[PDB]
């Protein structure tokens, strides 16, 4: 996850859209693969093909969210000419929420996902801007 | 890193004592007594220096003493010695205790013809002292300077200023 996250955060915001969308699709896809692995391990599919279908459904869903967040957030920053703006990420996060409202087909989930994935995405941008540490190195 | 310094092939040449292990075993007790001084000097050098390159000259004297020792046996007691080590060599374990008749003949020959007295049980395992002109090595390990120790906290232990100072607690 380190290197993929390093490619994404090296590209300047609002530019090189295709590279940003690839980085998030790989991030989203990997998350989908991890979820599929645990899902298949702990809830045994009735057949080999059901398990493969579940892996594709989850992985594609997660890659779909990752792709839309990267493209929409990069398109917004490019169009608005605001690279260091958390609003662009807020827009992309909600787009991902809509996709999760489409793959699961549930207007309620989409609305809830957009607000919460939208807020979460904006906080990530703020953290990058201001140097917020999630796993802070010990210092005192 | 540096180049591992080695002596020249010619700096390592010396006459070798080319006799078999049973021959050395047969002569071992008299050899220990006769050549002790150069032998102990060499072993002191090896344990102090911890470097085979630093005791080569002492090792050449070990060989010379061994050769002269075996040249004395050859001159005087060649026949009793040959019978004795040939008896040792037959045994698969080279046992002393199976050759006491032949050992007595060899022992009686060196005592008469050279004055050699076989050392007693326990003697050759003694720790002995060696007088050497060689200087004592100062840093045989080639140690670097050790890191300075942490500054040492000292003084009189006083109560903590205003107590624990934890949030609102006054003690």
């Amino acid at each position: 996850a380190k290197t993929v996250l390093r490619q994404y955060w090296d590209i300047p915001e609002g530019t090189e859209c295709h590279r940003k969308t690839y980085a998030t699709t790989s991030i989203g896809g990997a998350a989908g693969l991890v979820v599929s692995a645990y899902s298949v391990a702990l809830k045994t599919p009735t057949s080999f093909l059901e398990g493969v279908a579940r892996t594709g459904r989850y992985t594609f869903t997660a890659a779909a969210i990752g792709a839309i967040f990267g493209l929409t957030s990069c398109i917004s920053a490019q169009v608005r000419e605001k690279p260091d703006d958390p609003l662009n990420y807020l827009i992309g996060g909600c787009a991902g929420g809509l996709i999760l409202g489409a793959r699961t087909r549930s207007y309620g989930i989409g609305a809830a996902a957009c607000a919460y994935m939208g807020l979460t995405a904006a906080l990530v941008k703020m953290g990058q801007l201001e140097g917020w540490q999630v796993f802070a190195e010990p210092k005192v | 890193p540096g180049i591992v310094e080695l002596p020249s092939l010619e700096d390592l040449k010396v006459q070798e004592v080319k006799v078999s292990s049973s021959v050395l075993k047969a002569a071992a007790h008299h050899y220990g007594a006769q050549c002790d001084k150069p032998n102990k000097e060499f072993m002191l050098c090896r344990w102090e220096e911890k470097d085979p390159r630093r005791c080569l000259e002492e090792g050449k004297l070990v060989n010379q003493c061994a050769l002269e020792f075996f040249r004395q046996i050859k001159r005087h007691c060649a026949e009793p010695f040959t019978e004795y080590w040939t008896c040792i060599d037959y045994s698969g374990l080279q046992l002393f205790r199976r050759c006491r008749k032949q050992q007595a003949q060899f022992d009686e020959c060196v005592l008469d013809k050279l004055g050699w007295v076989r050392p007693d049980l326990g003697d050759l395992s003694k720790v002995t002292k060696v007088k050497t002109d060689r200087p004592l090595p100062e840093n045989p390990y080639h140690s670097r300077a050790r890191p300075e120790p942490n500054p040492e906290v000292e003084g009189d232990l006083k109560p903590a200023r205003h107590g624990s100072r934890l949030f609102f607690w006054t003690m």
Partner: protein
């Protein structure tokens, strides 16, 4: 062997210390007939 190998110092130690280090089997018998290497390495263990 290493005359025309760039950046190869001949006889360079791998240790920072200049202390004498006992060589391992590969250093001594590195370039010798397998018959001697086998005897040196496994002769004692294999002797009957």
């Amino acid at each position: 062997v290493m005359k025309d190998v760039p950046g190869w110092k001949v006889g360079e130690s791998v240790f920072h210390t200049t202390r004498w280090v006992t060589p391992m089997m590969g250093e001594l018998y590195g370039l010798r007939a397998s018959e001697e290497v086998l005897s040196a390495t496994y002769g004692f263990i294999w002797y009957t």
